[PDB]
Amino acid sequence: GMLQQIRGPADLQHLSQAQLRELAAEIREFLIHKVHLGPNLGVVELTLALHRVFDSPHDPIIFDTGHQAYVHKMLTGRSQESSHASAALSYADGLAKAFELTGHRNRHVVAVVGDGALTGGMCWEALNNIAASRRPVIIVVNDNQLLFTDLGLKYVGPVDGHDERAVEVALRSARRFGAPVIVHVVTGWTATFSDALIGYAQKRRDIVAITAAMPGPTGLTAFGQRFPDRLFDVGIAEQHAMTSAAGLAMGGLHPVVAIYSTFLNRAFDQIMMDVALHKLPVTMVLDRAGITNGMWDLSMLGIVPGIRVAAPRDATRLREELGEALDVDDGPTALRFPKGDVGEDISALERRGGVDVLAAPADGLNHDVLLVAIGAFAPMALAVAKRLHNQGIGVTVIDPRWVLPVSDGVRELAVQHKLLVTLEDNGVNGGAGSAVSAALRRAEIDVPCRDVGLPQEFLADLGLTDQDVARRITGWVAALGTGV
Amino acid sequence: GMLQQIRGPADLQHLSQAQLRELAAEIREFLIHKVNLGVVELTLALHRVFDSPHDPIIFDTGHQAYVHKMLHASAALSYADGLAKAFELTGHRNRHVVAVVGDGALTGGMCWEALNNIAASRRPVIIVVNDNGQLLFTDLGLKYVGPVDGHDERAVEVALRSARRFGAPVIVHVVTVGWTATFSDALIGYAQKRRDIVAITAAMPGPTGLTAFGQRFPDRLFDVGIAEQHAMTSAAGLAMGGLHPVVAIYSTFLNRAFDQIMMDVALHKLPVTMVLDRAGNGMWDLSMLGIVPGIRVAAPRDATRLREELGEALDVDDGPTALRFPKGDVGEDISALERRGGVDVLAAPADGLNHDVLLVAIGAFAPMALAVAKRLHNQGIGVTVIDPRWVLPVSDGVRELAVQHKLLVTLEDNGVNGGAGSAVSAALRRAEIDVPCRDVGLPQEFVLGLTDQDVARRITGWVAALGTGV
């Protein structure tokens, strides 16, 4: 077909309108054959158009979803990766300023964003700074004017996204203004949380819930179903979600904010200045935590003064620490769970200082290593203790249910061992292992600590298999010696 | 003495227009004495239209609050939203929540997040925007009262009573030698030899000493107002344009841009230099920048090291850099005896002292660490004081020096949580170095013991108690 014959954007220039119709249908058959097709199917037409008007890469086309760039990838071979939502525009603004200062204003920067990217404060920040200049920036919006016109920008549209000639005409018209222009194109872990919250609320009416335009994935829809006046979808407004919960908490209520782990860095200043500064009882619930995105939640929350963070190991513990979080009314609290299914329960042998002991060194073995299991790494921590038992090394496996602040239990147990090893589903920089090491050195305890977790960069490659973690620990115990 | 007679806001409601003019005169004069003058009428109107206790009036900044008092930015909107909801759910929605805000808080993307959400409900939220010097609000679905003169006390009152009568979200619009100096001269001197250097502030160009930069280079100073998030990603854009962006961040506003530093700059390995002033409010920077993958952070000890490390950060072209310094009169220079592994050694153990304590001085605690080493000299304890110049990542030089000592004490103008002490501890433990480490610094709380003598006492203590285990 003609797709096989597309060597690059320049091969699209001399095509007929009928040939472009078959090329579009061929790309759609390709997109179906190699997989979000709606975005994809729309960008198919809009991209065939934006490559017949602009000369990529000399005219930088900056896609935002990273998904809409697929058809652009098939025609070029390149996307230009991940970034904060609604930032293509801010890349565009900065790129146009760079071109002016180096004498390359001849280059037209075009930002192709979806309707969902129009929301967000950064989008509002970028559109305000672009409108404040007569720098040439072309914002293409794929929908699936009054605002933009009052915003101080030219508006071109609405344009039917499936009429390639209509997009091409509007695009050439946008390349003409030499000024900013908008081209409008028309085209059971979680289940445990839900049940637990519902019951906690059937019993207390100070509980309410907030979500950043994702109650379905986060399992809050049910709360709205049973308590509709207590679920508050704030749309894509993490910064506003956190501070409304601060206001809701100043109103006598106890908010529960559900935000994905990787999307928490956005509301950080609102966690420090609005919730932690005033010691307000807000409960944050962090799904998509771990590699079971995220990787930094434990570190970021450890920076938050007076915070209490929990990482459930099983569904039963999820129900337990939720009620404990909802009963803290003098500061923020946090829960962290993975995005997989909840495995079988893991029973504890005893509770010392709030710390759950999940395994003890067998009779005849010494208290050699205290294995602090963080998040859902508890199953692997038991398997490491099962390998180290076969070698003669005695392991105490513990789940500090509340990771932050480091509980007195872990401190009491660490002095009774020769090596402390933390195992967290988080980045090692400033993570749970670091906080443990800091907490016992603050208590004049100098037991050697080792942090095992995700790297500080961007599962067998990571060494996070019970066989390799046992090797590492074996190499650590050997350098320490014998005794008790 | 009219201000002296106000017992409560309800005493204001019985005064006359001229009695009010008199109160306002006195309030302006008392402000002059305690030495905002534009919010006088606005505050007065609010008091005589809303009862402070029942009707929550929240200010975005502490400045407008002064007259309210006598009788973080753009966040008053989202507080007002949640407070109105809390009133709806608890059976007292008759309370009128008033969010009084100042101009510019409207450029901040956090405000548009709240404006979109207040305009989506019928909960009465009265947003009073105070312009210090119109259609967006109408198309946002928010009634707008009109350009109201702010020095007309009667005009503001008429507007507020009209907004309280609307029963829906409504906008009421009312028209009414040094650390930083040494940085400005160094940057301007570095920019005169390099075309690729640009600078970007967020409505703080003078407090950051980037104004002198704009007076020489007006084409290369960009102020985005309240837009830290966009200021960061737009700086990423300029770096993708083959340029080197120097952003001026105050430490307490780095939180708002943290996700943009992470994904837009660090992940893309773009050479953005993030200068941090007012550092040390500025007590969790070394902790957050430690989470940033590939970040190179420096803490100057003196003026000469601000110049030298700024130039080093400008020659880093494969990833972000950061320079953190305090705001005040830089002290005299402290030249090092020697530089080992990139680390400046400021003091060695005197003859007869042994290598017992490694004092890792960060930021401007180098004068204090030298005084501590002098005190510990009187007790027969030899101290090596070092300035890791580039604090993050922890260099091989501090690892090569930590092995020759019995105790390591990090001394940082930062919170003990995630700071330089925990980053040094985490680095030695990854290289299988178990030398005991102690972090003297700042309690992780929104707040002491940093007096040379207190630090010396705790260190003597640790040295007499080195080695604690099963």
mmCIF file of N, CA and C in Angstrom, chain B residues 155-257:
data_model
loop_
_atom_site.group_PDB
_atom_site.id
_atom_site.type_symbol
_atom_site.label_atom_id
_atom_site.label_comp_id
_atom_site.label_asym_id
_atom_site.label_seq_id
_atom_site.Cartn_x
_atom_site.Cartn_y
_atom_site.Cartn_z
ATOM 1 N N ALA B 155 -18.995 52.454 48.188
ATOM 2 C CA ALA B 155 -19.122 51.685 46.956
ATOM 3 C C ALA B 155 -18.803 50.216 47.188
ATOM 4 N N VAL B 156 -17.790 49.938 48.013
ATOM 5 C CA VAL B 156 -17.432 48.562 48.335
ATOM 6 C C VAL B 156 -18.551 47.886 49.119
ATOM 7 N N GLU B 157 -19.131 48.599 50.091
ATOM 8 C CA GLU B 157 -20.225 48.039 50.879
ATOM 9 C C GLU B 157 -21.419 47.682 50.000
ATOM 10 N N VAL B 158 -21.764 48.561 49.054
ATOM 11 C CA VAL B 158 -22.874 48.291 48.142
ATOM 12 C C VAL B 158 -22.571 47.066 47.288
ATOM 13 N N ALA B 159 -21.306 46.898 46.892
ATOM 14 C CA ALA B 159 -20.940 45.738 46.087
ATOM 15 C C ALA B 159 -20.990 44.448 46.905
ATOM 16 N N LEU B 160 -20.567 44.497 48.173
ATOM 17 C CA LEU B 160 -20.542 43.283 48.988
ATOM 18 C C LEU B 160 -21.947 42.834 49.369
ATOM 19 N N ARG B 161 -22.841 43.787 49.655
ATOM 20 C CA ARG B 161 -24.225 43.432 49.949
ATOM 21 C C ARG B 161 -24.937 42.906 48.709
ATOM 22 N N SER B 162 -24.536 43.370 47.524
ATOM 23 C CA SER B 162 -25.087 42.819 46.290
ATOM 24 C C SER B 162 -24.571 41.412 46.025
ATOM 25 N N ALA B 163 -23.329 41.123 46.424
ATOM 26 C CA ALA B 163 -22.771 39.789 46.223
ATOM 27 C C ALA B 163 -23.355 38.791 47.216
ATOM 28 N N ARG B 164 -23.557 39.219 48.464
ATOM 29 C CA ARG B 164 -24.207 38.372 49.455
ATOM 30 C C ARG B 164 -25.677 38.132 49.131
ATOM 31 N N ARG B 165 -26.245 38.901 48.223
ATOM 32 C CA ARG B 165 -27.643 38.751 47.857
ATOM 33 C C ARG B 165 -27.824 37.873 46.656
ATOM 34 N N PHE B 166 -26.740 37.506 46.025
ATOM 35 C CA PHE B 166 -26.843 36.736 44.790
ATOM 36 C C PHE B 166 -27.179 35.272 45.049
ATOM 37 N N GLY B 167 -26.685 34.701 46.148
ATOM 38 C CA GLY B 167 -26.948 33.307 46.450
ATOM 39 C C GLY B 167 -26.183 32.324 45.599
ATOM 40 N N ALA B 168 -25.134 32.779 44.929
ATOM 41 C CA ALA B 168 -24.322 31.946 44.057
ATOM 42 C C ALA B 168 -22.904 32.486 44.076
ATOM 43 N N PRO B 169 -21.921 31.695 43.648
ATOM 44 C CA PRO B 169 -20.549 32.201 43.531
ATOM 45 C C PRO B 169 -20.487 33.493 42.727
ATOM 46 N N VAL B 170 -19.781 34.479 43.272
ATOM 47 C CA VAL B 170 -19.757 35.828 42.719
ATOM 48 C C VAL B 170 -18.366 36.413 42.920
ATOM 49 N N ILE B 171 -17.882 37.145 41.921
ATOM 50 C CA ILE B 171 -16.594 37.823 41.995
ATOM 51 C C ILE B 171 -16.840 39.306 42.225
ATOM 52 N N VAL B 172 -16.148 39.886 43.202
ATOM 53 C CA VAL B 172 -16.209 41.324 43.445
ATOM 54 C C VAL B 172 -14.827 41.902 43.163
ATOM 55 N N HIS B 173 -14.739 42.736 42.130
ATOM 56 C CA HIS B 173 -13.479 43.302 41.663
ATOM 57 C C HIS B 173 -13.313 44.720 42.194
ATOM 58 N N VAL B 174 -12.192 44.972 42.866
ATOM 59 C CA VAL B 174 -11.952 46.230 43.565
ATOM 60 C C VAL B 174 -10.589 46.772 43.149
ATOM 61 N N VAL B 175 -10.577 47.941 42.484
ATOM 62 C CA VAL B 175 -9.334 48.627 42.140
ATOM 63 C C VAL B 175 -8.960 49.556 43.287
ATOM 64 N N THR B 176 -7.672 49.600 43.613
ATOM 65 C CA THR B 176 -7.224 50.309 44.812
ATOM 66 C C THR B 176 -6.084 51.269 44.510
ATOM 67 N N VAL B 177 29.309 41.942 48.780
ATOM 68 C CA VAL B 177 29.080 42.154 50.213
ATOM 69 C C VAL B 177 27.912 41.324 50.743
ATOM 70 N N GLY B 178 26.864 41.190 49.933
ATOM 71 C CA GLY B 178 25.723 40.367 50.282
ATOM 72 C C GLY B 178 25.685 39.077 49.489
ATOM 73 N N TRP B 179 24.930 38.088 49.976
ATOM 74 C CA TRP B 179 24.808 36.823 49.257
ATOM 75 C C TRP B 179 24.170 37.037 47.890
ATOM 76 N N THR B 180 23.037 37.744 47.857
ATOM 77 C CA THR B 180 22.347 37.990 46.597
ATOM 78 C C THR B 180 23.140 38.917 45.684
ATOM 79 N N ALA B 181 23.846 39.896 46.252
ATOM 80 C CA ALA B 181 24.639 40.805 45.432
ATOM 81 C C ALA B 181 25.815 40.087 44.781
ATOM 82 N N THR B 182 26.499 39.218 45.532
ATOM 83 C CA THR B 182 27.621 38.470 44.969
ATOM 84 C C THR B 182 27.156 37.552 43.845
ATOM 85 N N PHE B 183 25.954 36.987 43.980
ATOM 86 C CA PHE B 183 25.402 36.147 42.922
ATOM 87 C C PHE B 183 25.133 36.953 41.657
ATOM 88 N N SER B 184 24.567 38.157 41.800
ATOM 89 C CA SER B 184 24.226 38.958 40.627
ATOM 90 C C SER B 184 25.471 39.354 39.843
ATOM 91 N N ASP B 185 26.532 39.764 40.542
ATOM 92 C CA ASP B 185 27.758 40.150 39.852
ATOM 93 C C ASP B 185 28.405 38.954 39.165
ATOM 94 N N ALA B 186 28.357 37.780 39.798
ATOM 95 C CA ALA B 186 28.974 36.599 39.200
ATOM 96 C C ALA B 186 28.214 36.162 37.955
ATOM 97 N N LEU B 187 26.884 36.088 38.049
ATOM 98 C CA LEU B 187 26.073 35.700 36.898
ATOM 99 C C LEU B 187 26.235 36.689 35.747
ATOM 100 N N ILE B 188 26.144 37.990 36.043
ATOM 101 C CA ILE B 188 26.309 39.005 35.003
ATOM 102 C C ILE B 188 27.701 38.914 34.391
ATOM 103 N N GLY B 189 28.704 38.577 35.206
ATOM 104 C CA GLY B 189 30.042 38.394 34.675
ATOM 105 C C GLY B 189 30.172 37.134 33.840
ATOM 106 N N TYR B 190 29.444 36.077 34.211
ATOM 107 C CA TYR B 190 29.476 34.850 33.423
ATOM 108 C C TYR B 190 28.663 34.988 32.142
ATOM 109 N N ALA B 191 27.591 35.783 32.175
ATOM 110 C CA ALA B 191 26.742 35.981 31.007
ATOM 111 C C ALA B 191 27.373 36.896 29.964
ATOM 112 N N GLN B 192 28.300 37.768 30.367
ATOM 113 C CA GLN B 192 29.013 38.604 29.409
ATOM 114 C C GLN B 192 29.973 37.808 28.533
ATOM 115 N N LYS B 193 30.283 36.564 28.894
ATOM 116 C CA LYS B 193 31.155 35.714 28.096
ATOM 117 C C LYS B 193 30.414 34.537 27.476
ATOM 118 N N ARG B 194 29.093 34.475 27.628
ATOM 119 C CA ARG B 194 28.316 33.337 27.153
ATOM 120 C C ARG B 194 26.963 33.812 26.654
ATOM 121 N N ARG B 195 26.652 33.486 25.398
ATOM 122 C CA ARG B 195 25.397 33.903 24.788
ATOM 123 C C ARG B 195 24.212 33.049 25.232
ATOM 124 N N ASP B 196 24.458 31.830 25.709
ATOM 125 C CA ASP B 196 23.405 30.851 25.945
ATOM 126 C C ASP B 196 22.727 30.978 27.307
ATOM 127 N N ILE B 197 23.098 31.955 28.126
ATOM 128 C CA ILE B 197 22.591 32.043 29.491
ATOM 129 C C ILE B 197 21.369 32.947 29.514
ATOM 130 N N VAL B 198 20.263 32.429 30.042
ATOM 131 C CA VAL B 198 19.055 33.210 30.258
ATOM 132 C C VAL B 198 18.628 33.009 31.705
ATOM 133 N N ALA B 199 17.796 33.911 32.194
ATOM 134 C CA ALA B 199 17.357 33.839 33.596
ATOM 135 C C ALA B 199 15.848 33.986 33.684
ATOM 136 N N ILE B 200 15.225 33.249 34.602
ATOM 137 C CA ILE B 200 13.742 33.256 34.708
ATOM 138 C C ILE B 200 13.345 33.324 36.183
ATOM 139 N N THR B 201 12.523 34.305 36.556
ATOM 140 C CA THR B 201 12.057 34.458 37.944
ATOM 141 C C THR B 201 10.578 34.264 37.947
ATOM 142 N N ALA B 202 9.981 34.235 39.125
ATOM 143 C CA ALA B 202 8.524 34.054 39.237
ATOM 144 C C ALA B 202 7.939 35.214 40.029
ATOM 145 N N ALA B 203 8.013 36.436 39.493
ATOM 146 C CA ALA B 203 7.451 37.649 40.136
ATOM 147 C C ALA B 203 8.345 38.107 41.281
ATOM 148 N N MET B 204 9.554 37.564 41.345
ATOM 149 C CA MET B 204 10.514 38.011 42.381
ATOM 150 C C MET B 204 11.858 38.286 41.697
ATOM 151 N N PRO B 205 11.983 39.354 40.887
ATOM 152 C CA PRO B 205 13.215 39.584 40.154
ATOM 153 C C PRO B 205 14.259 40.342 40.940
ATOM 154 N N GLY B 206 13.806 41.230 41.817
ATOM 155 C CA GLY B 206 14.736 42.045 42.614
ATOM 156 C C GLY B 206 15.149 41.319 43.864
ATOM 157 N N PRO B 207 14.205 40.774 44.656
ATOM 158 C CA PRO B 207 14.570 39.980 45.814
ATOM 159 C C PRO B 207 15.542 38.866 45.455
ATOM 160 N N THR B 208 15.671 38.532 44.166
ATOM 161 C CA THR B 208 16.563 37.440 43.715
ATOM 162 C C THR B 208 17.762 38.004 42.999
ATOM 163 N N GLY B 209 17.883 39.322 42.937
ATOM 164 C CA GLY B 209 19.089 39.911 42.345
ATOM 165 C C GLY B 209 19.203 39.568 40.886
ATOM 166 N N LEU B 210 18.068 39.322 40.232
ATOM 167 C CA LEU B 210 18.087 39.060 38.773
ATOM 168 C C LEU B 210 17.681 40.351 38.042
ATOM 169 N N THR B 211 17.257 41.370 38.783
ATOM 170 C CA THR B 211 16.896 42.670 38.186
ATOM 171 C C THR B 211 18.125 43.304 37.591
ATOM 172 N N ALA B 212 19.221 43.361 38.333
ATOM 173 C CA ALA B 212 20.421 43.886 37.692
ATOM 174 C C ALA B 212 20.780 43.098 36.437
ATOM 175 N N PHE B 213 20.461 41.802 36.406
ATOM 176 C CA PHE B 213 20.699 41.015 35.201
ATOM 177 C C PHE B 213 19.815 41.492 34.053
ATOM 178 N N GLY B 214 18.574 41.878 34.358
ATOM 179 C CA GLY B 214 17.677 42.343 33.317
ATOM 180 C C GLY B 214 17.989 43.748 32.840
ATOM 181 N N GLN B 215 18.610 44.568 33.694
ATOM 182 C CA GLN B 215 18.979 45.913 33.266
ATOM 183 C C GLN B 215 20.120 45.881 32.259
ATOM 184 N N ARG B 216 20.968 44.866 32.325
ATOM 185 C CA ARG B 216 22.038 44.736 31.309
ATOM 186 C C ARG B 216 21.516 43.888 30.159
ATOM 187 N N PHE B 217 20.936 42.729 30.454
ATOM 188 C CA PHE B 217 20.320 41.939 29.395
ATOM 189 C C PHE B 217 18.802 41.967 29.520
ATOM 190 N N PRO B 218 18.109 42.897 28.857
ATOM 191 C CA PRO B 218 16.644 42.912 28.964
ATOM 192 C C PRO B 218 15.982 41.829 28.140
ATOM 193 N N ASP B 219 16.663 41.313 27.116
ATOM 194 C CA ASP B 219 16.116 40.273 26.256
ATOM 195 C C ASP B 219 16.196 38.885 26.876
ATOM 196 N N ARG B 220 16.892 38.731 28.003
ATOM 197 C CA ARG B 220 17.168 37.420 28.578
ATOM 198 C C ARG B 220 16.656 37.291 30.011
ATOM 199 N N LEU B 221 15.767 38.183 30.443
ATOM 200 C CA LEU B 221 15.146 38.108 31.762
ATOM 201 C C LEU B 221 13.646 37.931 31.569
ATOM 202 N N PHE B 222 13.167 36.753 31.929
ATOM 203 C CA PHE B 222 11.788 36.466 31.770
ATOM 204 C C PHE B 222 11.115 36.302 33.095
ATOM 205 N N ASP B 223 10.079 37.109 33.337
ATOM 206 C CA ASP B 223 9.299 36.980 34.597
ATOM 207 C C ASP B 223 7.937 36.364 34.261
ATOM 208 N N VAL B 224 7.624 35.204 34.846
ATOM 209 C CA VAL B 224 6.346 34.499 34.526
ATOM 210 C C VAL B 224 5.297 34.835 35.596
ATOM 211 N N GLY B 225 5.618 35.743 36.522
ATOM 212 C CA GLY B 225 4.685 36.040 37.625
ATOM 213 C C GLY B 225 4.496 34.811 38.493
ATOM 214 N N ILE B 226 3.304 34.628 39.063
ATOM 215 C CA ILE B 226 3.031 33.394 39.863
ATOM 216 C C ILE B 226 2.802 32.233 38.883
ATOM 217 N N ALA B 227 3.879 31.556 38.475
ATOM 218 C CA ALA B 227 3.766 30.416 37.535
ATOM 219 C C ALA B 227 4.992 29.516 37.694
ATOM 220 N N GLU B 228 5.369 29.211 38.938
ATOM 221 C CA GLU B 228 6.594 28.408 39.193
ATOM 222 C C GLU B 228 6.565 27.136 38.330
ATOM 223 N N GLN B 229 5.416 26.459 38.279
ATOM 224 C CA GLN B 229 5.295 25.209 37.484
ATOM 225 C C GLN B 229 5.687 25.494 36.026
ATOM 226 N N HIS B 230 5.053 26.494 35.407
ATOM 227 C CA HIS B 230 5.365 26.835 33.995
ATOM 228 C C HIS B 230 6.756 27.443 33.914
ATOM 229 N N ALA B 231 7.151 28.187 34.934
ATOM 230 C CA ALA B 231 8.520 28.689 34.833
ATOM 231 C C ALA B 231 9.531 27.554 34.711
ATOM 232 N N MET B 232 9.271 26.416 35.364
ATOM 233 C CA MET B 232 10.207 25.296 35.307
ATOM 234 C C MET B 232 10.196 24.629 33.937
ATOM 235 N N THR B 233 9.011 24.235 33.462
ATOM 236 C CA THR B 233 8.937 23.544 32.183
ATOM 237 C C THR B 233 9.318 24.462 31.024
ATOM 238 N N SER B 234 8.974 25.750 31.103
ATOM 239 C CA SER B 234 9.441 26.665 30.069
ATOM 240 C C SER B 234 10.960 26.787 30.090
ATOM 241 N N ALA B 235 11.577 26.707 31.276
ATOM 242 C CA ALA B 235 13.034 26.634 31.344
ATOM 243 C C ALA B 235 13.552 25.351 30.700
ATOM 244 N N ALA B 236 12.828 24.241 30.867
ATOM 245 C CA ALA B 236 13.169 23.037 30.119
ATOM 246 C C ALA B 236 13.082 23.288 28.618
ATOM 247 N N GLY B 237 12.076 24.051 28.183
ATOM 248 C CA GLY B 237 11.975 24.391 26.773
ATOM 249 C C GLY B 237 13.169 25.184 26.279
ATOM 250 N N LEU B 238 13.587 26.201 27.041
ATOM 251 C CA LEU B 238 14.761 26.974 26.645
ATOM 252 C C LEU B 238 16.019 26.118 26.611
ATOM 253 N N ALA B 239 16.112 25.105 27.479
ATOM 254 C CA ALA B 239 17.287 24.239 27.471
ATOM 255 C C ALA B 239 17.282 23.305 26.270
ATOM 256 N N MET B 240 16.081 22.954 25.794
ATOM 257 C CA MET B 240 15.974 22.114 24.573
ATOM 258 C C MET B 240 16.296 22.997 23.360
ATOM 259 N N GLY B 241 16.327 24.319 23.561
ATOM 260 C CA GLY B 241 16.661 25.251 22.466
ATOM 261 C C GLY B 241 18.156 25.495 22.409
ATOM 262 N N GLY B 242 18.933 24.701 23.154
ATOM 263 C CA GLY B 242 20.402 24.841 23.154
ATOM 264 C C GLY B 242 20.853 25.940 24.097
ATOM 265 N N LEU B 243 19.978 26.379 25.008
ATOM 266 C CA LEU B 243 20.324 27.492 25.933
ATOM 267 C C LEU B 243 20.514 26.943 27.357
ATOM 268 N N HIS B 244 21.081 27.753 28.259
ATOM 269 C CA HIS B 244 21.253 27.328 29.676
ATOM 270 C C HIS B 244 20.413 28.245 30.571
ATOM 271 N N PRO B 245 19.250 27.776 31.073
ATOM 272 C CA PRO B 245 18.377 28.605 31.894
ATOM 273 C C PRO B 245 18.790 28.671 33.357
ATOM 274 N N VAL B 246 18.905 29.887 33.900
ATOM 275 C CA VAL B 246 19.231 30.051 35.309
ATOM 276 C C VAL B 246 17.965 30.541 35.995
ATOM 277 N N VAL B 247 17.329 29.676 36.746
ATOM 278 C CA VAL B 247 16.098 30.038 37.434
ATOM 279 C C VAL B 247 16.441 30.495 38.845
ATOM 280 N N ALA B 248 15.681 31.462 39.345
ATOM 281 C CA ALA B 248 15.855 31.977 40.702
ATOM 282 C C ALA B 248 14.666 31.514 41.539
ATOM 283 N N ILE B 249 14.892 30.492 42.360
ATOM 284 C CA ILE B 249 13.853 29.857 43.162
ATOM 285 C C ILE B 249 14.094 30.190 44.627
ATOM 286 N N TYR B 250 13.056 30.674 45.304
ATOM 287 C CA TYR B 250 13.061 30.706 46.757
ATOM 288 C C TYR B 250 12.634 29.337 47.276
ATOM 289 N N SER B 251 13.336 28.853 48.308
ATOM 290 C CA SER B 251 13.261 27.438 48.667
ATOM 291 C C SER B 251 11.834 26.993 48.965
ATOM 292 N N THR B 252 11.050 27.840 49.633
ATOM 293 C CA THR B 252 9.691 27.462 50.003
ATOM 294 C C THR B 252 8.748 27.377 48.806
ATOM 295 N N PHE B 253 9.165 27.842 47.628
ATOM 296 C CA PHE B 253 8.357 27.737 46.420
ATOM 297 C C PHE B 253 8.857 26.648 45.479
ATOM 298 N N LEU B 254 9.945 25.966 45.836
ATOM 299 C CA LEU B 254 10.416 24.825 45.065
ATOM 300 C C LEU B 254 9.466 23.636 45.170
ATOM 301 N N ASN B 255 8.624 23.589 46.207
ATOM 302 C CA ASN B 255 7.668 22.492 46.334
ATOM 303 C C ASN B 255 6.657 22.505 45.194
ATOM 304 N N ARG B 256 6.198 23.694 44.796
ATOM 305 C CA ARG B 256 5.192 23.781 43.743
ATOM 306 C C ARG B 256 5.735 23.307 42.402
ATOM 307 N N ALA B 257 7.042 23.443 42.184
ATOM 308 C CA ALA B 257 7.665 23.063 40.925
ATOM 309 C C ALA B 257 8.354 21.705 40.991
#
